Structure formats: C-alpha cells, structure tokens
Design a protein around this ligand. Sequence first.
Ligand code: CA
Ligand code: CA
Ligand code: CA
Ligand code: CA
Ligand code: CA
Length: 156
Amino acid sequence: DQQAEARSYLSEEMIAEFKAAFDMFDADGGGDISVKELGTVMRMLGQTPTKEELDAIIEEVDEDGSGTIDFEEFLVMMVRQMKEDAKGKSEEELAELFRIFDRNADGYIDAEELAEIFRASGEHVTDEEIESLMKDGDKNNDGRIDFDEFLKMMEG
Ligand SMILES: [Ca+2]
Ligand SMILES: [Ca+2]
Ligand SMILES: [Ca+2]
Ligand SMILES: [Ca+2]
Ligand SMILES: [Ca+2]
C-alpha cells in the first residue's frame, strides 16, 4: 500500500532516476541494499553510523522483513524524503515572507508595513484594499497581523 502510493507520486522519469541511484547503491548488483552497502554510502556522506543505526534506517522501510531494502522500499524511502523537503522549503518561504513584511520586526505586520511591501513589489493597491486585507487577517481584532494569522491568510 505504501509502495503503491509512492509509485503513484512519481513519474516514470523520476522512478528511472531513482533506479539509477538504487543501482549505484546496490554495490554487488544483487537487487537489494544491505547494511554494508548502506553504510558505505553514509560513511561517504561523512557520517559514522553503527550497524544498529543502519539496521534502524532499514526498518523504517523494510516491509517484507528481509533486513535489506529493495527497489519498491527504496522509492517509499525517497518519496518520504521528497515530501519532507517540499514541506520544509514551503515553510521557509512562509517564515521569510513574514520576515520581509515585518520591517520593524516586532513580530507583527501592520497596515503600513503591509502597504510598503506591496508598494515595494511594484503593485498598485488602494487604501480600501489594504483595509479589506487587514480586516480579513485580523482574527483577534487588535489591528495587527501575527504569524498565526499570516499563515491562515497565506495557505487560506
Ligand atoms: Ca512520463
Ligand atoms: Ca546488494
Ligand atoms: Ca526488504
Ligand atoms: Ca512589524
Ligand atoms: Ca491580530
């Protein structure tokens, strides 16, 4: 089920990129990645994992209990890393967006700060538009916009 889902998330084109990586990691070309093969790749990345630590990573994926990671398990592993990064890059955009707007960085975006950003972006925006904006974001009605409110406004 997890592998089927993983598969559906990737394109032919992505799978083949991953078969290639998989094949490289698969040092003996046997079709599945062992604790030894994974360690070589991790050591390479500069880490010092113990055999138990490698065994653990494999368990994250190991749905047939072989103690090794085969291709179907590899994509699940890759897709999990792909979704985590996308999520992490998405959050970084939001944190920094809020940081650009909050020029006096008191942790809140006010109507003036809001205006300057659109101003700076090169777009028109009327005092009525900003007003509408500030009133739809101000959920606790204190006139300013906090990170909680901003997020709600962003992801909508
Ligand atoms: Ca295709
Ligand atoms: Ca192998
Ligand atoms: Ca397995
Ligand atoms: Ca501010
Ligand atoms: Ca508020």
